[PDB]
Nucleic acid binder design. Sequence first.
RNA 1: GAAGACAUUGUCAGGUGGGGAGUUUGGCUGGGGCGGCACAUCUGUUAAACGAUAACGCAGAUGUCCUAAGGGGGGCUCAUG
RNA 2: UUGACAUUGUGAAGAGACAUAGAGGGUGUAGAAUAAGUGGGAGCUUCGGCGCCAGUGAAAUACCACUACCUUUAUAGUUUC
RNA 3: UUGACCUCAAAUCAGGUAGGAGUACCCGCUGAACUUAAGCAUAUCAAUAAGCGGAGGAAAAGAAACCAACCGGGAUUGC
Lengths: 193, 142, 43, 56, 136, 99, 216
Amino acid sequence: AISKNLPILKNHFRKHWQERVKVHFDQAGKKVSRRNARATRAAKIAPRPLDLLRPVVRAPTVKYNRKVRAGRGFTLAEVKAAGLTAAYARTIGIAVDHRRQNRNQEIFDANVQRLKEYQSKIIVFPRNGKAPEAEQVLSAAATFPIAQPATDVEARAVQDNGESAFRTLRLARSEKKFRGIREKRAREKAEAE
Amino acid sequence: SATYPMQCSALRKNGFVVIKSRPCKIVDMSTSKTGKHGHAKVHLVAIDIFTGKKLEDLSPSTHNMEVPVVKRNEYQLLDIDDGFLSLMNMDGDTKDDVKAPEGELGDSLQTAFDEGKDLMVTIISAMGEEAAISFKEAARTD
Amino acid sequence: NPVDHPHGGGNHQHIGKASTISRGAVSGQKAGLIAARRTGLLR
Amino acid sequence: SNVRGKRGKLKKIQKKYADQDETERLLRLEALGTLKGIEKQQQRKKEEIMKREVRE
Amino acid sequence: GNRKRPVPKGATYGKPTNQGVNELKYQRSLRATAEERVGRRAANLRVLNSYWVNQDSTYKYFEVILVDPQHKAIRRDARYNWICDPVHKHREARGLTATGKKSRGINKGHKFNNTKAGRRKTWKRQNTLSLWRYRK
Amino acid sequence: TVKTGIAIGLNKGKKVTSMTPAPKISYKKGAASNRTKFVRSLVREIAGLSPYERRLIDLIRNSGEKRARKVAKKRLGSFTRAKAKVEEMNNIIAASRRH
Amino acid sequence: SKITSSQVREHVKELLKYSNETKKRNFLETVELQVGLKNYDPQRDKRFSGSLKLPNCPRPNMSICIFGDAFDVDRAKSCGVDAMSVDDLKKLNKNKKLIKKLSKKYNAFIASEVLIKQVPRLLGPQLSKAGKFPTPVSHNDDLYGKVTDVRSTIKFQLKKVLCLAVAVGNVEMEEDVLVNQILMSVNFFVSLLKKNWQNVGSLVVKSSMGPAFRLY
RNA sequence: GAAGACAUUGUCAGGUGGGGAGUUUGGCUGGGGCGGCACAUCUGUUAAACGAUAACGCAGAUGUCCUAAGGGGGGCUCAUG
RNA sequence: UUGACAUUGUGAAGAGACAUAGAGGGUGUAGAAUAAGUGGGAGCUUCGGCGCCAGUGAAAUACCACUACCUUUAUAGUUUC
RNA sequence: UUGACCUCAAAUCAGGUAGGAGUACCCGCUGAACUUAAGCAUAUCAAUAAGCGGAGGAAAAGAAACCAACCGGGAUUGC
Ligand SMILES: [Mg+2]
Ligand SMILES: [Mg+2]
């Protein structure tokens, strides 16, 4: 069992694991059928660009809030500011998310601008007549790329005023740590007659 | 501790054991082989010191049985009132917590105290309960 | 044989335990004198 | 009838000894031997008084 | 009440962790077994829902709503003709009614990680060994 | 409630200009309407009191709100529901005393 | 402790206010603690008995007799305490009326280690019946020191009645001393008592010729 | 007709329960069993004049005791004849 | 097998236990007397009387409180049988 | 007397529908032990095998009584 100087292994193979073994032999064929499905879908929706327009949106956690990415759909407030109803936007190819909110003006303005450029770039056909054929592109995401915002300029002047940025962090942590005991002492000082 | 373990074969006659959480004193020990190949079993017959009941247990010989600590202590009577003896220790300590005996020992002790002998009382402690077992008279130091 | 009855077995034919059985005994145990108030021949 | 563990006995008499007469009651308690126990308890009370009388 | 384990004379023939007979509980609800018996009684109908009406010490009383998928008023009336699709045969037997999904544990959230897409489906998904062509 | 600009502390986080979005109607689900208030008052008049509510009325009358809240916490699930139940029963006592 | 020091301080304050200023008495008034214990049985439960020595004496002048040997009587001449010798006890000749008179004469008795054996044989069991039994003293120890000790003794013994009483101290002592002595006596009582602070029926503080004051 | 809000039934809780279930039932060892402990230790010897060194080798011992029977200082000299 | 809760509704009586409001009560003999016990107490006094020394009695007597055990009335009482 | 209503029936009444098979995959119920722990009872094997009920070309799940604690994300499924 235990033997020479080796690391302790944890290999979870004490069930009937050979009954559930999935070997992906069909990677290449599955990729080929996936491309076939994309091509037949594009031929079925032959003018339309195979994917909806997605908003730019800020990634959730503190690990990833430095980056911006694509969302599910646009806010109703965003599409009302763009100047078209949610039902009409869904019919002309704009993803609408009824359950996200706008708390950030920069993200709101970016999504409104993105909707303005989409409405400038598309051609909407009449529902009855001529259908003036227009040589589809296949990726609204590639025609409207998601761009990371420029946060600063690359050269500035040094503005130093003596706080060292370590004392500031330490004092902020200390006042958060000793917040509630200070209002407890303040409350008992106030109710001390 | 109040009680300490022991082995059944280490036990012998006129020794104290714990049987069914009672302090007991052995009167009989008998060992018989279980099977020809097997170890012998010890059959123990003992008497409770306080109540006088007969309790028996059989066990493997290698098994460990619980054994109490029994202390016998010597005192002089002061008074017998309301069924509670009052005793007097060497160095002058006094206890009244002992209840008087209820049997023929208690009757003989009551008559002896009524007719006025100086009575020497032996009381035993085992597992937190206290009783009086015997009384004599002081032949000297009257 | 002891597989067949509580009284079975042994190198002599004998009962072993007491033959008076509790009323609270279970099926397979009630073999003997069930809930006997007294036993023996009275005179 | 307000001391502990008496109503548990009183349930059984209503259950199984409701239809009974005193001849049968005396016969059954004499055949079960409880009457001797009652007699010896009252006797033990008698020597409890008697030993005090002999002491006096 | 509970479900007594149907073993002869209480003998389970195993380890002492499985010797319980009396205090074992059925994993589905009395509402579920009620509507399942109603569906077996009327197999030509489809069970929609059920609700409690009454109870006593011995019985619990439910009323079961059923819809006839052959009647033309349900063949038409597009609000209800989804019940005529053959994937809805014996929803109460597959646990697809409201109390069936409640007993299967089908709910969103961190409290339902074992039972969210199906307990056995998730168990197979996280007990599968996945090997690719170019081994990672 | 503005952020401070630094990574730790009381109001840590980046300062961005806020928007204060329009309130969702689902945030007012538990709000009482006039029509349901009228219905609840009428059915309370029609049905009266449950037995545990009656014995709670006796507990505010005799043994006080602390014992009333203890019994209502045993009867209902939580202390919050017990406090609300004792408060509304005290309202029923005041209204019946006015009656 | 259910009883609090500030409440003890308060009750001691009106107690000394009544005893000293409003109705002064010519005899010196002893402060008494009268206790009653609850959910307890003298017949079945163990009969607790214990003693503590207070730092400042409750009764400086209470009568004490020293049964003693030659050395004990010679020291008792220096101590100024009443004594009868073994020859005197033999004189007494176990006469009940005179020994009852002695028992009502002296509240406390101090006896030597040697003679404490035959103190019951010369005197009999009426001392144990009264509850005044002689306390042992040795040649090494100081008799007057142990007279001060016995005069400062506080004893709790169960007996048969479920209510006890001791004398905490005088009225004339200082307030902090009285508070400290009553607190340590209550603590000693609950230390002797099993299942402490819950088998306490009632605690009463009083002064001699004074009304009762109830501490829980 | 009888019985009656008691039985019954449901769920918990205490007792009883080899009727039944599952499992266990040391080691060393001139075979095993009984006996013993050579199973954790200590002194002398075997032990072959560094150290190490076996046997169910020999002669014994341990599961405690001590607020002094620990620490420091001073004075004195013991068994025996 | 025993207990609780539910099934479980409708009516009358009789007991018991607590909360806190208050009342009265205690006779072997001896001893001036009716001694429930404890603990303090040598002075308290309202009478200048009662205790104390002293009598008897296991237990002693004024003047204080406490604790049991009894009987005893009442509550928009709390409850159990 | 007559005519309703409610509830419950009967018809070889008019028209329909269910059962059984298959079961690799799917949705549930029920449910072990061998084995591992160098013994063994919790544990493990395993929420598996066997048993039972019910579908489709997929099924199931699915448009938050969600995740989060951030400058917040946004049905389900799968990698
Ligand atoms: Mg036999
Ligand atoms: Mg069942």
